[PDB]
């Protein structure tokens, strides 16, 4: 028996020495050296410095450029708003609490951070799904005589918010719970504790099936269909050098987009699953810290991929940054 329990928490350290304290009440300098808490803060700082300019600029640039304000770009803006919830809901709270060495905001702060942070990274996830769907509809032309317009864009965005609430909301009201994770400085969802009073087990599954497998399948399907439709259109007109490049760039990108989706959620899935299936084992705070490192850095690498690598967006940015010129 590996941790120390308490009303709204679970410290991954043994109280046999009697040193363990509430993560809401006193520094956890026995889980990890103080320098490792500082390094945690170093990192949050990095993600705020990189994640906030990149994501905010995206919004700003859309305000300065009329050609960016098209339906096919609503979901990309949604993605940037979501990342901003991650940055302010998640990263800055964790910067502050890490510098105390414990979660100074109490259980309310825990629910709050937990909710917004969770809320942000799910809108992002689902944005990425919705996007592939739209891109598959528009290009693969699966429905005949259909043209994607502003009212589909909006539903797309709203479907994204609804799916997020469908997992950010439950733990606030009984199905699972938010508690400090890892080094106890940031509050996530409890998926590693079997806490029958809230039914952690069933939620963990539902999140796995609905908020992991579904998204994965859809993304793979849509981008499969699309790298297919484009590889075929290119075979059927090799006399176009342009159509040949287009099919090669679209493939390169889809690979990048898929691989980056896995790098972001696969760890969380891999751990969630392996914990679920080795329930009689001890997992360290730094073991819980890993999948969160990968999933959170997506507030930087996602805008890089879906925005800085989008020809339209990139140009407007360079314009805006170079003082109106070039």
């Amino acid at each position: 028996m590996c941790g120390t329990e308490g009303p709204n928490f679970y410290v991954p350290f043994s109280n046999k020495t009697g040193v363990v304290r509430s993560p809401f009440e006193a520094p956890q300098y026995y889980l990890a050296e103080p320098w490792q808490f500082s390094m945690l803060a170093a990192y949050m700082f990095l993600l705020i410095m990189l994640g906030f300019p990149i994501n905010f600029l995206t919004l700003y640039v859309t305000v300065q450029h009329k050609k960016l304000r098209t339906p096919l770009n609503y979901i990309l803006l949604n993605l940037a708003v979501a990342d901003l919830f991650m940055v302010f809901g998640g990263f800055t709270t964790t910067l502050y609490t890490s510098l105390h060495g414990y979660f100074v905001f109490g259980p309310t702060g825990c629910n709050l951070q937990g909710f917004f942070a969770t809320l942000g990274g799910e809108i992002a996830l689902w944005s990425l799904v919705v996007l592939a769907i739209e891109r598959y509809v528009v290009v693969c032309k699966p429905m005949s005589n259909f043209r994607f317009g502003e009212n589909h864009a909006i539903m797309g965005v709203a479907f994204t918010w609804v799916m997020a609430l469908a997992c950010a909301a439950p733990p606030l009201v009984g199905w699972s719970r938010y508690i400090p994770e890892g080094m106890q400085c940031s509050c996530g969802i409890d998926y590693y504790t079997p806490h029958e009073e809230t039914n952690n087990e069933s939620f963990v599954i539902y999140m796995f099936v609905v908020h992991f497998i579904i998204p994965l399948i859809v993304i793979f399907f849509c981008y499969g269909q699309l790298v297919f439709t484009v590889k075929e259109a290119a075979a059927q007109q090799q006399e176009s050098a342009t159509t040949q490049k287009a099919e090669k760039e679209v493939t390169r990108m889809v690979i990048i987009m898929v691989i980056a989706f896995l790098i972001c959620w696969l760890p969380y899935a891999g751990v969630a699953f392996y914990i679920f299936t080795h329930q009689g084992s001890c997992f360290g705070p730094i073991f819980m810290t890993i999948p969160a490192f990968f999933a959170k850095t997506s507030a930087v690498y996602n805008p890089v991929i879906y925005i800085m690598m989008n020809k339209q967006f990139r140009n407007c940015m360079v314009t805006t940054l170079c003082c109106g010129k070039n």
């Binding site: 287009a246 679209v250 339209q312």
Partner: peptide, 11 residues
């Protein structure tokens, strides 16, 4: 396809 690709920011 090239025109739908451009619109998507894909090419």
């Amino acid at each position: 396809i090239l025109e739908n690709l451009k619109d998507c920011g894909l090419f």
